[PDB]
Amino acid sequence: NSNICEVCNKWGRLFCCDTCPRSFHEHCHIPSVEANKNPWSCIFCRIKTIQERCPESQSGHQESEVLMRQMLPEEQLKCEFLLLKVYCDSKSCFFASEPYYNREGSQGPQKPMWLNKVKTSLNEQMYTRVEGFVQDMRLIFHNHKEFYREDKFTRLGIQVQDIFEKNFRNIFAIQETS
C-alpha cells in the first residue's frame, strides 16, 4: 500500500485498501473508513466493481436523465466518489468549511454552501435525487464567482468547478460532445 493518504497526500493514521494499493485517513475517505470489515475495499474499488458488473453503464448518458435519478445505493456511492474527487484537489480547501462574507462592494450569497455541508448531507441521506447533490456542488462555485467579482481570486472557483465537472462527466458516463 501507499504510505500517504490518497486524498490529502499526507502521512498519518492510514487505513489501507485490500484490493488496491491506496491508503486513507479515516475522514478523508468518503464514506468515513468503516470500523471493522476485513477485507475492506476503498470507494475507488467499489466504483470499479459497478462498472465491471455492468459494462454498459459506461455508455453515454444525457445529464438531464442522470440528474433525475433517485439516490439508490449505486447513485449514493457515485456522488460520494465525485465529492471525494473534489477533495483530492488541494484547492478544495477554500471551499471545505463554512464561509463568511465581508468585502467592500459585495454582498454574501443568499444560500451559502460548502463541501463539508454537502458531505454531511450525503452522510445523513438528505438528497433524494442526484440533482440535489449536483445543484449544491455547483452552488458552491457560483456563490464564489458572484461574491469575488473582478478579484482574481474568482479563478479558484473556476478551477475547482472544472475538477468537479470533468469528474461528473467521467463517473456518470455523460455522453461526450463538442
Contacts with Zn ion by CB under 5 A lie at: 5, 7-8, 17, 20, 22, 25, 28, 42, 44-45, 54
Residue placing its CB nearer to Zn ion in the complex, 29 or 144: 29
Least distance to Zn ion from the beta carbon of 3, Å?
Answer: 12
Show contacts of 21-30: CB within 8 Å, 24+ apart. Answer: 28/87, 29/84, 30/80, 30/81, 30/83, 30/84, 30/87, 30/119, 30/122
Rounded least distance, CB 153 to Zn ion, Å? 25
Nearer Cβ to Zn ion, position 17 or 130? Answer: 17
Nearer to Zn ion, 72 or 177 (CB): 72
User: At closest approach, how far in Å is the CB of 45 from Zn ion?
Assistant: 3
Contact in structure between 24 and 15 (CB atoms under 8 Å)? yes
Cell of 6: 490518497
